[PDB]
Amino acid sequence: MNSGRANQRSKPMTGLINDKKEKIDAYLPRKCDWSNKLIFSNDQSSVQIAIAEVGENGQATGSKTNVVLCGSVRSKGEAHIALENILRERGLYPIQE
């Protein structure tokens, strides 16, 4: 049910904003795309995959898509199924001739 999914990524992520509508959080952390957990400041086993964009002729385009996969999900041997799905979502895993 795409339902809830589309809506959480919906708007931009912005940390602790004060009355003066200022951002304060020293930095805005990466968030695991398949789980929506926070990627640590020292999360050893969490990785950011870089996949490349192709252009209807077998050639490669100077354009890449990234996938953040938190630690645990990568540890439960999810990644392969996790990724293969974040790619369905961003319309890509199914690779037509």
Partner 1 sequence: KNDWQPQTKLGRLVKYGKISSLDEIFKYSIPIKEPEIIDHFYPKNKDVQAEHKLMEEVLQITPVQKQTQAGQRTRFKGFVVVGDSNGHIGLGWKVAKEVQGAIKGAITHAKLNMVPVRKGYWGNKIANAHTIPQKITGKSGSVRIRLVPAPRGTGIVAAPIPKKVLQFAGVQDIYTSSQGCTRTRGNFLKATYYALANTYRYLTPDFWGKPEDNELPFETFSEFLHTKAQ
Partner 2 sequence: MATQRKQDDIKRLLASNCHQATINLNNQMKRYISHKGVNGIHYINIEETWQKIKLAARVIAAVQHPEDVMVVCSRIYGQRAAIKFAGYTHCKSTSSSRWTPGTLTNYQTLKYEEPRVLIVTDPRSDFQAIKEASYVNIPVIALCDSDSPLAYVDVVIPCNNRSTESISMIYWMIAREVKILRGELSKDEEWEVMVDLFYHKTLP
Partner 3 sequence: VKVNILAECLKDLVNAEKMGKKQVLLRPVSKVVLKFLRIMQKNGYIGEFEVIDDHRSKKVVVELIGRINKCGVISPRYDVPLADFEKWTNNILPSRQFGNVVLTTTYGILTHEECRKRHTGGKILGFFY
Partner RNA sequence: AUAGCGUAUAUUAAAGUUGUUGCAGUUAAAAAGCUCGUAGUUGAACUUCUGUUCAGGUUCAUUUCGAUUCGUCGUGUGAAACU
Partner RNA sequence: GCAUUUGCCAAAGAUGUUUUCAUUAAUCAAGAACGAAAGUUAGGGGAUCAAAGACGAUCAGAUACCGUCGUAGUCUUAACUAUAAACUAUACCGACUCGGGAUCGGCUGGAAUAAAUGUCCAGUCGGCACCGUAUGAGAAAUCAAAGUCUUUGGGUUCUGGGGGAAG
Residues that bind partner 2 (CB under 8 A): 43-52, 54, 57-60, 64, 69, 74-77, 79-81, 83-84, 87, 93-97
Residue 91, judged by CB atoms within 10 A of its CB (0-12, 13-18, 19+), counts as: exposed
Question: Quick one: 11 or 57, whose CB is closer to RNA?
Answer: 11
Stretch of 7-15, 53-61, 74-82, 83-91 contacting partner 1, by CB under 8 A:
7-15
Distance of alpha carbon 21 from alpha carbon 97, whole angstroms:
49
Q: How far is the CB of 27 from partner 3 (least distance, A)?
A: 20
Residue in the structure block whose two tokens are 């369905």: 88
Q: How far is the CB of 86 from RNA (least distance, A)?
A: 18
Collapsed DSSP state (helix, strand, coil) of residue 6: helix
Token pair belonging to 38: 């926070």
Token pair belonging to 70: 């938190």
Applying CB under 7 A, the residues found at the interface with RNA are 43-46, 71-72, 74-76
